[PDB]
């Protein structure tokens, strides 16, 4: 139909493309490589061939599909690794034993021959169905509970509903008729990837995201459906944090996408998730792999596909959101996406606004982040799903003044600042308290109050203690260890304890792998209450000596209790909530009694 | 006491003040040049190509 | 089979500028088609077509554009991408940057032509690494270990013995053995090296007796700068063929990873492309990814590729774009300290930044000890605290080091003295070294240790 005119890396030029519209999928060459119109000029047009363009030739056929970028968002996507173009990796490897990814394969996104146990809902013949109405549900596997929903922009009266039983994706299920014509609906639904799936309304989110890591859970919390950013400069290995969130978050579904991510990481994910189990209220063993889908394409994969990868990931997340589930997506190394934008824009000679990154960088990144949120779903029943986006902006050279980091910090709500200093010291979380900040603190005030009113005060006090610790460290470095106030000594103490125990998690040990919120609150309360007892002792100690000067002697005589305080983190969560809460009550009361008695002694 | 204070001030200066300011100057020079000059020259070249 | 066609020969060169040769009236061009230009004088050189537009074709020659006339040079379109004749016989020989033999031997008889820059591995098929390597150096195997399929480079500025370290690793390389036919088949890329260093490499490899199992890819600085980029490619193509389609494990070594970067910057500047940081091309992250992200263990096959590149911090700054991108992609780093070299330490490895991201899987019950992880963590963390103690002592005085700080300073001193140091040919086994590692850890009190539990080391027994 059409033929290629110019090829320049990923970006190509095809002649005879008069009827083509922007953002229309197109087949390139004999191998039918995927392509999406970006710049149309005259009869010619521009195509960003997602696949590798090496080996093309002039006058290679170019076939217009007339349809924009689309993903087959039907059931069965859960638990399967897909390429940036939604192609199934495992099926491709099975069909062609060559482990190398072929070029020119056209394996469908989802198998047309799988039989799924289909459970029709309370729908009846002639009922007035609307767009987004859950006419039925299907069990993809254990803990999936997939809900087949009518595609948006569809309505009519139920002329036919399929009976319960196994069904191929070709099978028609609903035969709704709106304007007389009776159209059939099949399980597969395709959504323009770039366009954002419609929502009935957007509502404020008030459910905190439980990461299971003390520092992020308490110091800089995030709400479900919120937007987060992790810089994670080179060597910090942010992917361990991302994987921990995927394993131990309270999300209903995980959509992990890595653009530019190294292949080993995806191997590790696919090999380790199935064995790892999560405990539901029923308690049966179940693999997070069922709960997780992987859209990542490795760094070896062509760069043009980074956008397509990220947009397919987010649209799959949105699809699960409309099903009523609360899904979280992690976008590994969006800096690779920025570099992909720069490379594509560079070929088009589009003017470099700043550091080679094109001008329309903030806009696209803003849209990507803005697709997140907590929404009221469409149709019946009245589902309220959400999408949580936790992206990654790797700073080139570790300078946060970078353009992608700047735009992200501009449009992000909660920000977790990774720093090289803690990473070098083998701190492990490496989450710097000063730079990190959460704009969601005000929203979660209600949840904190209903959970524990003490949490707000202890959180503010811990922040103040950390800031004072930084200021005192600077002042001491300027002056020296000597001439250090006893009150300042008490402040630096238990702040060192905060850093060593509460703000750090091993993340590779059974105890520190997952930190429940209640035990985090207990540890923070223990730290602040020890600090407050120290302040009270400084206030009154039968003379300034016993009050504050003897803080060193207090540390000597309270060494066992201080060691218990620092070791409280070492206990595993497998003991169960009653065991941990009883132990923390015992520790706090013993510390208070010992401190008061020692404060009573000689005073 | 005075000699200890003066020696501490001098050692602190040599070990912190200059050792922090010199990296600041180096980073400022690197950013200024490698960003402003590079991108300005690139913009000028792109404009020249456009005219060409 | 479809009837063959003899390659077309053109003479329509219609403009030369920089390293690029422009053609016109080309009948059916092909992108990245290899062309072999013959000049008027009769000499020949190769090149790649960088863009295909209409009947025009923009070609960047390899040997340079000097001596090319607009009305006498002839261009021939081979109609194929660049291909290296990979074969099993390639072992125990040397090759130029482009792969031409230089070992005074016949050209390789290929088992099968393989297009370089081959497709990626289906990530469903890639598998994690789970086998340590006996490189022949103590400090690498004791801490910041290497797994058979793990990539990790050596960071080392100019003037450091990193080349000698690489030669020692290559000669002393071997499996843990805790066989020979499938043993380590080392491929030694040499991107942009000095002639003296090249002679050193040739002599060391020939004398060591490793020529039975080692292939060299030498590329001197005198060679054309573009021939430098294709080198650490051809090398990885041969490594892939030898490991995956032939079976034997490969330990690829790349030297002067920085020279590859320079080669890219020069080529990019010639192409007049969008510049990233410090004038390097913006897509260098991709083009390093295509080099680093090949080593690994494909599942269906018993082979394994392990990548150990060597970088060079230009201004002795890890924040330079090349080490930044590497540390982003390369899954860990081994760091070499200039100060330790000044202290006359032959293996001047600074363990403070030397970390192996995949070491958590390299350790285990199959090899090493149950206290390996804890000992590594302690000897990695207490060293930083000892350095901070040394800084505090310097900024205050000798009396500043208290009863606890003095212990940390003594630990740092003994660590820099005994543990790090090693012989020029020392195959110090893991247990003997871990004994003195625990001795260093026990210089500090056996109860003041915060991160490590005492029971973990208590599993091990002194003497």
From Swiss-Prot, chain A:
Complexes and interactors: V-ATPase is a heteromultimeric enzyme composed of a peripheral catalytic V1 complex (main components: subunits A, B, C, D, E, and F) attached to an integral membrane V0 proton pore complex (main component: the proteolipid protein).
Reactions this protein catalyses: ATP + H2O + 4 H(+)(in) = ADP + phosphate + 5 H(+)(out)
Membrane spanning stretches: none
Gene Ontology CC terms: plant-type vacuole; proton-transporting V-type ATPase, V1 domain
Similarity comment: family membership: Belongs to the ATPase alpha/beta chains family.
GO molecular function: ATP binding; ATP hydrolysis activity; proton-transporting ATPase activity, rotational mechanism
Record-given protein name: V-type proton ATPase catalytic subunit A
Keywords recorded for this protein, A-Z: ATP-binding, Hydrogen ion transport, Ion transport, Nucleotide-binding, Translocase, Transport
Matching HAMAP family: ATP_synth_A_arch
Gene3D superfamilies for this protein: 2.40.30.20, 2.40.50.100, Bovine Mitochondrial F1-atpase, Atp Synthase Beta Chain, Chain D, domain 3, P-loop containing nucleotide triphosphate hydrolases
Residue sites binding ATP per the record: 232-239
PANTHER family, per the entry: H(+)-TRANSPORTING TWO-SECTOR ATPASE (PTHR43607:SF1), V-TYPE PROTON ATPASE CATALYTIC SUBUNIT A (PTHR43607)
Entry EC number(s): 7.1.2.2
Keyword Translocase among UniProt keywords: yes
């Amino acid at each position: 139909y059409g033929y290629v005119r110019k090829v320049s890396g990923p970006v190509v030029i095809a002649d005879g493309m008069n009827g083509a519209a922007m953002y229309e999928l197109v087949r390139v060459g004999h191998d039918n490589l995927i392509g999406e119109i970006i710049r149309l000029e005259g009869d010619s047009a521009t195509i960003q061939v997602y696949e590798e363009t090496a080996g093309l030739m002039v006058n290679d056929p170019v076939l217009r599909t007339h349809k924009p970028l689309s993903v087959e968002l039907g059931p069965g996507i859960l638990g399967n690794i897909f390429d940036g173009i939604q192609r199934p990796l495992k099926t491709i490897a099975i069909r062609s034993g060559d482990v190398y990814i072929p070029r020119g394969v056209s394996v469908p996104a989802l198998d047309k021959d799988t039989l799924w146990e289909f459970q029709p809902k309370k729908i009846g013949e002639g009922d007035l169905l609307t767009g987004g109405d859950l006419y039925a549900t299907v069990f993809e596997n254990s803990l999936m509970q997939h809900h087949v929903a009518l595609p948006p922009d569809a309505m009519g009266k139920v002329t036919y509903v399929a009976p319960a039983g196994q069904y191929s994706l070709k099978d028609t299920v609903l035969e709704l008729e709106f304007q007389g014509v009776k159209k059939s609906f099949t399980m597969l639904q395709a959504w323009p990837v770039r366009t954002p799936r419609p929502v009935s309304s957007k509502l404020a989110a008030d459910t905190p995201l439980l990461t299971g890591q003390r520092v992020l859970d308490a110091l800089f919390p995030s709400v479900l459906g919120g937007t987060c950013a992790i810089p994670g400069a080179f060597g910090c290995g942010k992917t361990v944090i991302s994987q921990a969130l995927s394993k131990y978050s309270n999300s209903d579904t995980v959509v992990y996408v890595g653009c530019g991510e190294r292949g080993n990481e995806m191997a590790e994910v696919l090999m380790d998730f199935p064995q790892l189990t999560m405990t539901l209220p029923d308690g049966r063993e179940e693999s997070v792999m069922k709960r997780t889908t992987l859209v990542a394409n490795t760094s070896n994969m062509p760069v043009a596909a980074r956008e397509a990868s990220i947009y397919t990931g987010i649209t799959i997340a949105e699809y699960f959101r409309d099903m009523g589930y609360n899904v979280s997506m992690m976008a590994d190394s969006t800096s690779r996406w920025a570099e992909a934008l720069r490379e594509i824009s560079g070929r088009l000679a589009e003017m470099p606004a700043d550091s080679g990154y094109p001008a329309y960088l903030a806009a696209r990144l803003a849209s990507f982040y803005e697709r997140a949120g907590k929404v009221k779903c469409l149709g019946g029943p009245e589902r309220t799903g959400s999408v949580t986006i936790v992206g990654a902006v790797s700073p080139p050279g570790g300078d946060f003044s970078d353009p992608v980091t700047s735009a992200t910090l501009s449009i992000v709500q909660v920000f977790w600042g990774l720093d090289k200093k803690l990473a070098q010291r083998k701190h492990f979380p490496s989450v710097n308290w000063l730079i990190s900040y959460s704009k969601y603190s005000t929203a979660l005030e209600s949840f904190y109050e209903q959970f524990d009113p003490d949490f707000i005060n202890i959180r503010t006090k811990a922040r103040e203690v950390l800031q004072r610790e930084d200021d005192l460290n600077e002042i001491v470095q300027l002056v020296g260890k000597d001439a250090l106030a006893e009150g300042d000594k008490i402040t630096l103490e238990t702040a060192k304890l905060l850093r060593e125990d509460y703000l750090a998690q091993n993340a590779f040990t059974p105890y520190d792998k997952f930190c429940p919120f209640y035990k985090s609150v207990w540890m923070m309360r223990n730290i602040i209450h020890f600090y407050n007892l120290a302040n009270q002792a400084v206030e009154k100690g039968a003379g300034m000596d016993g009050q504050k000067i003897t803080y060193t002697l207090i540390k000597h005589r309270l060494g066992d209790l201080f060691y218990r305080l620092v070791s409280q983190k070492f206990e595993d969560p497998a003991e169960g909530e009653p065991a941990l809460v009883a132990k923390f009550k015992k520790l706090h009361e013993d510390l208070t009694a010992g401190f008061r008695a020692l404060e009573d002694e000689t005073r | 006491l005075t000699l200890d204070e003066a020696i501490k001030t001098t050692n602190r200066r040599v070990n912190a003040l200059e050792n922090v300011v010199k990296p600041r100057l180096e980073n400022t020079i690197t950013y200024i040049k490698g960003e402003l000059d590079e991108l300005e020259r690139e913009d000028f070249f792109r404009l020249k190509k456009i005219q060409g | 089979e479809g009837t063959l066609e003899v390659a077309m020969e053109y003479r329509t060169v219609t403009g030369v500028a920089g390293p690029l040769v422009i053609l016109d009236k080309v009948k059916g061009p092909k992108y990245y088609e290899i062309v072999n230009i013959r000049l008027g004088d009769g000499t020949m050189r190769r090149g790649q077509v960088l863009e295909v537009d209409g009947e025009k074709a923009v070609v960047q020659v390899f040997e340079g554009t000097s001596g090319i006339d607009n009305k006498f040079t002839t261009v021939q379109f081979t109609g194929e991408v660049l291909k290296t004749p990979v074969s099993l016989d390639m072992l125990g020989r040397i090759f130029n940057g482009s792969g031409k033999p230089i070992d005074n031997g016949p050209p390789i008889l290929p088992e099968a032509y393989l297009d370089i820059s081959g497709s990626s591995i289906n990530p469903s098929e890639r598998t994690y690494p789970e086998e340590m390597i006996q490189t022949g150096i103590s400090t690498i195997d004791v801490m910041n270990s290497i797994a058979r399929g793990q990539k990790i480079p050596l960071f080392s500025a100019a003037g450091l013995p990193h080349n000698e370290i690489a030669a020692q690793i290559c000669r002393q390389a071997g499996l843990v053995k805790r066989g020979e036919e499938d043993n380590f088949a080392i491929v030694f890329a040499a991107m942009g090296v000095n002639m003296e260093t090249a002679q050193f490499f040739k002599r060391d490899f020939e004398e060591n007796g490793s020529m039975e199992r080692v292939t060299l890819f030498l590329n001197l600085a005198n060679d054309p700068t573009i021939e430098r980029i294709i080198t650490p490619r051809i090398a990885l193509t041969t490594a892939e063929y030898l490991a995956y389609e032939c079976g034997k494990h490969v330990l690829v070594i790349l030297t002067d990873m920085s020279s590859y970067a320079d080669a890219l910057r020069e080529v990019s500047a010639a192409r007049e492309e969008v510049p990233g940081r410090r004038g390097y091309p913006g897509y260098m992250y991709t083009d390093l990814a295509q080099i680093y992200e090949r080593a690994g263990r494909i599942e269906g096959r018993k082979g394994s590729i392990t990548q150990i590149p060597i970088l060079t911090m230009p201004n002795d700054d890890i924040t330079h774009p090349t080490p930044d991108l590497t540390g982003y992609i390369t899954e860990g780093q081994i760091y070499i300290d200039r100060q330790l070299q000044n202290r006359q330490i032959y293996p001047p490895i600074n363990v403070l930044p030397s970390l192996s991201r995949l070491m958590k899987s390299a350790i285990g019950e199959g090899m090493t000890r149950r206290d390996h992880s804890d000992v590594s963590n302690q000897l990695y963390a207490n060293y930083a605290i000892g350095k901070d103690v040394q800084a505090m002592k310097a900024v205050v005085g000798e009396e500043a080091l208290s009863s606890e700080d003095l212990l940390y300073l003594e630990f740092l001193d003994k660590f820099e003295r005994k543990f790090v140091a090693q012989g020029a040919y020392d195959s110090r086994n893991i247990f003997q070294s871990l004994d003195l590692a625990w001795t260093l850890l026990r210089i500090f009190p056996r109860e003041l240790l915060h991160r490590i539990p005492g029971k973990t080391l208590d599993q091990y027994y002194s003497r």
